[PDB]
């Protein structure tokens, strides 16, 4: 019904109007379980990295958000060691006008410009706020270590 119809539509829109540096789609035949990839944004400390994600759509999609997590380690104030993502639209600010394409754009922007006042990893938030050249150095080191 409504969830599968929206997931098929959002997959066709992704495929017809591809992003430049993200991909997402069903793992196999299960339309509710997707994988995504995001290339580290150019001019970010993640540049050259490839980051994998898992996406689980709920049965009442599009009226509740997908559950999205990283499976690649990343140094970021809003992503923890389990890959959990602190992002407003995946919790309190979800709307059925959002789509998986818009979620991927939002995650890309979050990698480009973190929310350190809503952290999952307090020390990374503190270094982001107090010493940005050090933050960028470490995030580049972790990109080389885990995402290449």
UniProtKB/Swiss-Prot annotation:
- Known catalytic reactions: S-ubiquitinyl-[E1 ubiquitin-activating enzyme]-L-cysteine + [E2 ubiquitin-conjugating enzyme]-L-cysteine = [E1 ubiquitin-activating enzyme]-L-cysteine + S-ubiquitinyl-[E2 ubiquitin-conjugating enzyme]-L-cysteine; S-ubiquitinyl-[E1 ubiquitin-activating enzyme]-L-cysteine + [acceptor protein]-L-lysine = [E1 ubiquitin-activating enzyme]-L-cysteine + N(6)-monoubiquitinyl-[acceptor protein]-L-lysine
Functional summary from the UniProt entry:
Accepts ubiquitin from the E1 complex and catalyzes its covalent attachment to other proteins. Catalyzes 'Lys-48'-linked polyubiquitination. Mediates the selective degradation of short-lived and abnormal proteins. Functions in the E6/E6-AP-induced ubiquitination of p53/TP53. Mediates ubiquitination of PEX5 and SQSTM1 and autoubiquitination of STUB1 and TRAF6.
Q: PROSITE patterns, from UniProt? A: UBC_1, UBC_2
Q: Describe, as the record does, how this protein assembles with itself and its partners.
A: Interacts with SCF (SKP1-CUL1-F-box protein) E3 ubiquitin ligase complex. Interacts with CNOT4 (via RING domain). Interacts with E3 ubiquitin-protein ligases CBLC, PJA1 and PJA2. Interacts with PDZRN3. Interacts with PPP1R11. Interacts with E3 ubiquitin-protein ligase PHF7; the interaction inhibits cleavage of PHF7 and promotes association of the complex with the nucleosome core particle.
Consequence of changing residue 65 to A: Abolishes histone H3 ubiquitination and decreases interaction with PHF7
Provide the gene name from the record: UBE2D2
This one is known as Ubiquitin-conjugating enzyme E2 D2
Q: List the SUPFAM superfamilies hit by this protein, alphabetically.
A: UBC-like
Q: What is the effect of changing residue 91 to A?
A: Abolishes histone H3 ubiquitination and decreases interaction with PHF7
Organism listed in the record? Homo sapiens
Which protein family is named in the record?
Belongs to the ubiquitin-conjugating enzyme family.
């Amino acid at each position: 019904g409504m969830a599968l119809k929206r997931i098929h539509k959002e997959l066709n829109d992704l495929a017809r109007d591809p992003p430049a540096q993200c991909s997402a789609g069903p793992v196999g035949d299960d339309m509710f379980h997707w994988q995504a990839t995001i290339m580290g944004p150019n001019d970010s400390p993640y540049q050259g990295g490839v980051f994998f994600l898992t996406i689980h759509f709920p049965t009442d999609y599009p009226f509740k958000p997908p559950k999205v997590a990283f499976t690649t380690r990343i140094y970021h104030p809003n992503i923890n060691s389990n890959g959990s993502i602190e992002l407003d639209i995946l919790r309190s600010q979800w709307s059925p006008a959002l789509t998986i394409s818009k979620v991927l754009l939002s995650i890309c922007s979050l990698l480009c410009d973190p929310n350190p006042d809503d952290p999952l990893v307090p020390e990374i938030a503190r270094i982001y706020k107090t010493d940005r050249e050090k933050y960028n150095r470490i995030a580049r080191e972790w990109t080389q270590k885990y995402a290449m």
